C-alpha cells in the first residue's frame, strides 16, 4: 500500500534537491568528463594566480585556499538547510532539534555532495568554473596538504556506486533525519520520518539499480563511513587551531563547531 506514496516522496525530494542545489551531480559529471559544449584548471602556483578571477589580504596560499573552502562550506550549509526544510515533517520538529540535526549532519552531507564534484584527479570549484588537481592540494604545506585527501579517498569509492541525483536526494534526507544525534529532545518523530525515508531509499535503489543487489546495505555503511570522515576532519581542525594563528573562522562555522564532537 505504501509503495506509490514512497515514490511520491522520492519525487518530492528530487524536485526539492533540484531547487536547493545549483550544481547537480548530473551537471558536474558532464563537466568532469569533458562533455559540455571551459573550467579553468589549477594545478600549480602560477595557474592558481592566473585562475583566481575565474574562481583574503596577503596571507599565505595554504590559508587562502582554506579560507575559500570555508566560504564555500558556509554557502553549502545554507543550501542544505533549505533542502532539509523541504523534507516532509522536518519544519514541524522542535526547532532545537532542527538545529541539532543540521549541526551534526551538515558536514556528512557536504562530504557526500563534494564526491559529486570529484574524480580521482581533482575537484570542481566555483560552481564548475574551476578544477583544482588533487596533486596540487597535496602539495600545500602541512597540515593543509592533508585536508582533502580523505575526502578524495571517500569520493572515489562512493562514486563507484554510480548513484544519481534522485538516489542522493533520499540518501541525504536519511542522514539529516538521524535520531542518534546528541541532545535531541524528541527522537521518536525523527525516527518515524527516517523510517519512511529508509523505506523510500530501499525502493528507489531496487527500481533505479535493479542489477545492484545489496546497494541499500552498501549505502547504510557509507553513512557510518561519513561519520568517521567528519571525526577525522574535526581532529585535523584541532591541529590547525593550535599551530596556526592566522586563522579566522566564519561565524556560522564557529557556531556549528562549538561543542561539536
Amino acid at each position: 500500500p505504501e509503495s506509490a506514496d514512497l515514490r511520491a516522496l522520492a519525487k518530492h525530494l528530487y524536485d526539492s534537491y533540484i531547487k536547493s542545489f545549483p550544481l547537480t551531480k548530473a551537471k558536474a559529471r558532464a563537466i568532469l568528463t569533458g562533455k559540455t559544449t571551459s573550467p579553468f584548471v589549477i594545478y600549480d602556483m602560477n595557474s592558481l594566480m592566473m585562475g583566481e578571477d575565474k574562481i583574503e589580504q596577503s596571507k599565505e596560499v595554504a590559508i587562502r585556499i582554506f579560507q575559500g573552502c570555508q566560504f564555500r562550506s558556509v554557502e553549502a550549509v545554507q543550501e542544505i538547510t533549505e533542502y532539509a526544510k523541504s523534507i516532509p515533517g522536518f519544519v514541524n520538529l522542535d526547532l532545537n532539534d532542527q538545529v541539532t540535526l543540521l549541526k551534526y549532519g551538515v558536514h556528512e552531507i557536504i562530504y557526500t555532495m563534494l564526491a559529486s564534484l570529484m574524480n580521482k584527479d581533482g575537484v570542481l570549484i566555483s560552481e564548475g568554473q574551476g578544477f583544482m588537481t588533487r596533486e596540487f592540494l597535496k602539495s600545500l604545506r602541512k597540515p593543509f596538504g592533508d585536508f582533502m585527501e580523505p575526502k578524495f579517498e571517500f569520493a572515489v569509492k562512493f562514486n563507484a556506486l554510480e548513484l544519481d541525483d534522485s538516489d542522493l536526494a533520499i540518501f541525504i534526507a536519511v542522514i539529516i533525519l538521524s535520531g542518534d544525534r546528541p541532545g535531541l529532545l524528541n527522537v521518536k518523530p525523527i525516527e518515524d520520518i527516517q523510517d519512511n525515508l529508509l523505506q523510500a531509499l530501499e525502493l528507489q535503489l531496487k527500481l533505479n539499480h535493479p542489477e545492484s543487489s545489496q546497494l541499500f546495505a552498501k549505502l547504510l555503511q557509507k553513512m557510518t563511513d561519513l561519520r568517521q570522515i567528519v571525526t577525522e576532519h574535526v581532529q585535523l581542525l584541532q591541529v590547525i587551531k593550535k599551530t596556526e594563528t592566522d586563522m579566522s573562522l566564519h561565524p556560522l562555522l564557529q557556531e556549528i563547531y562549538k561543542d561539536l564532537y
Partner: peptide, 17 residues
C-alpha cells in the same frame, strides 16, 4: 531553549521564508 540560544545563525536560516 538551550540549543536555540547557542545557534543564532542556524536559527535564522531555519526560520526564513
Amino acid at each position: 531553549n538551550s540549543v536555540x540560544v547557542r545557534h543564532x545563525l542556524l536559527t535564522a536560516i531555519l526560520x526564513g521564508v
